Amino acid sequence: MDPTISVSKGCFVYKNGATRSLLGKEVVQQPFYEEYRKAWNQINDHIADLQHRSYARTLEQLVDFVVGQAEREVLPTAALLTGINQPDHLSQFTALTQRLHAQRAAMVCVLQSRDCATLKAAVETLVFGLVEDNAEVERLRRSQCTMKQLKSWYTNNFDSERRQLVVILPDFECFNASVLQDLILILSAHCGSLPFVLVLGVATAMTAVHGTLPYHVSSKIRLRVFQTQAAPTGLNEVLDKVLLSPKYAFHLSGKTFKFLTHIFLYYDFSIHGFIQGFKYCLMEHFFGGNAFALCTDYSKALGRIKQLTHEDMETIRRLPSFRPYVEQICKRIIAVLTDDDYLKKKLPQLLRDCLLHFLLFRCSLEFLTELVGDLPRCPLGKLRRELYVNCLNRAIISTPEYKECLQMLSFLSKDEFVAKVNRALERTEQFLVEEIAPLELGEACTAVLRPKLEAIRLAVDEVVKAGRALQKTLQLIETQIVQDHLRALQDAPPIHELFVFSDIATVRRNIIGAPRAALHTALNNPHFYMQCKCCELQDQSLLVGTLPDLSVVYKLHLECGRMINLFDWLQAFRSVVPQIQARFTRAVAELQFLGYIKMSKRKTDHATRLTW
């Protein structure tokens, strides 16, 4: 057969000069790769800055705890009630090691659960981590890194000066219990001679710490509890300060937004998986061509329009929103649909229109979300993200929930109503001064929005100095903010497809993995994949005789009970369609290889189905 298929070897090197940026220069010098790398570096650095600014308080408290032990038997120890999302916290512990090394207050070992199956391996990795960490601040074999060598090394180095010997244990739940209790007794035996600090990483709760530490072990523990912030609070902070920021030209659609938050809130609390899914959304958006490299800030966008070729003109014509733009316009549409240079000259107005519409969308949302989410029962939700998904997914005024918001705001007393609208005005004005003024194309956005806010404030003064005026104030709020600057995504200004990402099907396919659905629809109707002219089934339980051989065996399998004799199965398959016995054996072997059946051991010539 193939040379890779060998009876002896299992791994096959194809070395090409390996000693001791995958793409070619055509792709990296393409503008869409440049804009994708720029937007991704900006988004990733902003999210990392948000994560560091959220961790910084607990970091200062842990560093103060270690330095307070250094100013000074039980080993001092600090439980850190971190979240379920364990991989994310390695950056937290790395920042703790960076601070402790920068202050020269301590040296840090990190004890992973994979390195400590036994007490011997735990002591060896602990001493090796402390000695090599001190060597890396300013190589003995792992067989000889005894705790006596750690004491001799600490006396040769830091006895003349006291550095703490911090021992991070990031995955406290994953440890063997006996190894961890013996290690705590070993570190408690050396207190006084060696200053140990034992910070921990408890993903669950303190009841796990009180359960895994027995009376003897907890007799030598002086632990202090720190609390990392909750994962949904971090998701809400990232979604409000990054994915809804005015300064980024790339926006998700409401379906993609709801899908990524559904993966976070309904499956895994890892921020990192949400970031990689947003990165795949950004890549799937920006790899469609240089027409999507127009999706950037306005000056580089004008340079990209003056760069453009012809395939980019074709893919800005093909996108669905251009067709209403053409039919809502004769010589002008001949010059648009053929002359190309006229479309190059008319692109900046459409790009400024789209970027200005999304800036006005963010400002009108920063208005509306306080005024709606302060209400009891919250028909449109509390935070900005739910109103973002609601105003993008469908027209907002036609929804029943907007009618409920108008009714429950109509039922208010005058004082709380005027205080609520004035709070919305002050919040919107603070947002217009803080976040839209530095931004390019923010002066025109402030020039559009600010007189409308002055008109709403004059309506507030009219209802202050004078019952039915509250309905006029609601009408002014509706038709200068909700109606004009908060349109549904289908009613967005044309060639908004360059800026939003609405293709949810392929990205849901490539992020959410469902092997069982593909195996099910391949073993039930092969015609969905093969697209034969003869193999179509009008219903999935028909069992036609022209099917591929795995499907017939799978259906005769599916249509009966648990334990299955092979012989009547073979008679039924022979009745459906020598080499036929070898084809049945090949199908049973493939169906066992997929895990659908298994051979019985206690009973020969029988098979049990593993599925239900």
């Binding site: 014509r317 067709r323 053409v326 039919e327 004769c330 010589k331 549409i333 001949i334 649909l337």
Partner: peptide, 17 residues
């Protein structure tokens, strides 16, 4: 509606106008 036949029919509606 396919983009090619739509663009052709719109150009025909322009040239017939």
């Amino acid at each position: 509606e396919d983009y090619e036949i739509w663009k052709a029919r719109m150009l025909a509606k322009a040239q017939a106008k």
